Amino acid sequence: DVVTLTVGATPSPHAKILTYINDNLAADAGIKLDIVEYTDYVQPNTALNDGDLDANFYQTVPYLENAEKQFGYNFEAGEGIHLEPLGVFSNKHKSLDELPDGGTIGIISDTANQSRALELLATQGLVSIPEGDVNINTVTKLKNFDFREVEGPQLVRSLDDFDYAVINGNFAQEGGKTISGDALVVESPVDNPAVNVLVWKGDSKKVDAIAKLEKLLHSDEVKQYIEKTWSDGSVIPAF
Ligand code: MET
Numbered sequence: 001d002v003v004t005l006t007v008g009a010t011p012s013p014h015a016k017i018l019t020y021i022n023d024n025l026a027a028d029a030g031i032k033l034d035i036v037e038y039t040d041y042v043q044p045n046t047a048l049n050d051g052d053l054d055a056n057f058y059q060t061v062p063y064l065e066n067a068e069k070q071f072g073y074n075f076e077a078g079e080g081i082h083l084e085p086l087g088v089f090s091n092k093h094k095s096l097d098e099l100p101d102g103g104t105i106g107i108i109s110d111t112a113n114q115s116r117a118l119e120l121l122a123t124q125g126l127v128s129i130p131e132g133d134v135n136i137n138t139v140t141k142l143k144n145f146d147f148r149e150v151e152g153p154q155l156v157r158s159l160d161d162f163d164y165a166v167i168n169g170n171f172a173q174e175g176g177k178t179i180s181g182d183a184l185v186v187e188s189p190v191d192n193p194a195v196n197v198l199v200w201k202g203d204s205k206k207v208d209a210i211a212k213l214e215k216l217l218h219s220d221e222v223k224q225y226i227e228k229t230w231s232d233g234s235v236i237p238a239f
Contacts, residue, residue, distance in 0.1 A: 003209035006034040008044040008056040012173035013082065013226070013235045014196070018057060020225045021216050029212045039153050041110055043195070048199065049073055054206050055213065057081075061196040063112040070111065074202045076088070078214045080195025080238035082226055084169025086120050087183030091159045096124055096184055099163055101144050106158035106165030107136060109149040116194060117166035120187050169234050179233040186233070195238040 009015040015037050022033040036053065044056040045067055059067075061080070067073055068120065088096060088105075097104070107117050115134040121127045128140040138146045148157045155167045156175030164184070166173045172178070179186050198217055200210050223237045230236075 002030055002032055003206055004032040004034055005054045005206065005209050005213060006036060006052070007213070008036045008038050008047055008053045008058065010039065010044075010058045011037050012170060013084070013230065014057045014170070015072060016229065017081070017222060017226065019219070021213070025216045025221060026213075027220070029216055031209050031212050033213070041113075041119060041152055045071075045073060045075075045199075047076065048201055052080045052205060054199040055198055057196070057198050057217070059199060060196055062116070062193055063110070064197065064199060066112040069149065073084040075199050076202050078198040079218055080197060081217050081222075082195060082196050082238050083189055083192055083236045084196065084234060085114060085179055085183075085185075085189055085192075085236070086169070086187040086194070087167055087172060087179055088120065088124075088164050088185040089156075089159060089167050089172065089182055090164045090184055092163050094184060096126065096164065099126075099143060099145055103145045104162040104164075105145060105147050106150045106155060106167075107147045108152050108166065108168070110133070110152070113150075113152070113168060116187075119209070120166060120185065123188075124185055139179055173234065181232060189236055 009018050015035050018035050044058050047053045048056050061087055064077055073107055108114050118134050118139050122129050126142055153163050155171045158165045198214050218239050226235055226237045
């Protein structure tokens with residue numbers, strides 16, 4: 001009666017953290033992990049919904065709340081494990097002030113993350129968000145440039161085409177990039193609601209096993225693994 005759990009995860013940090021747990025902690029907890037790596041945001045929630053995964057570990061609390069609102073998903077989430085500060089990246093400039101007149105900024109296409117990237121740009125004086133649904137058509141541009149919506153896994157590649165791109169940590173990681181080494185502008189980690197959580201479906205038969213994985217993901221061992229593995233500011237424990 002060891003329970004096996006199929007968990008979907010983006011490769012870095014999430015699959016790495018899950019692999020540390022699998023290889024170091026799962027056996028003592030009486031669980032086995034079957035890690036499935038995913039490279040986009042749509043697919044792990046669909047697989048959790050449709051019955052292919054027991055849990056996923058890739059998404060932020062605000063993205064989850066939006067997915068439940070837009071799609072009706074019946075999911076349950078755990079405590080914040082870690083934060084990935086959002087960054088503005090570029091291969092053409094080292095300062096956002098060098099945004100050419102009619103220049104371009106790549107921006108993700110999902111609601112929650114486009115909204116978060118738009119806020120980050122507001123802290124830099126580049127867009128104005130009305131007080132009160134935040135997207136490229138509802139913000140006011142305060143300098144002359146164009147946004148270009150790009151699908152998440154195309155963000156790092158879009159740096160070849162555009163002056164800048166706003167890029168979530170998991171994608172920056174895939175592209176060999178770090179916050180310390182490569183972010184032009186770094187989202188503040190203070191009072192940041194975009195913590196990453198374990199998500200499972202409300203009716204799982206495996207809730208004893210998933211509560212064990214939740215406890216392992218918020219252990220001192222996992223915090224130390226995160227702090228040892230990422231000291232470049234790209235992945236910060238949220239506990
Ligand atoms: C799928 S919501 C964004 C998740 C991403 N790993 C982040 O923390 O920004």
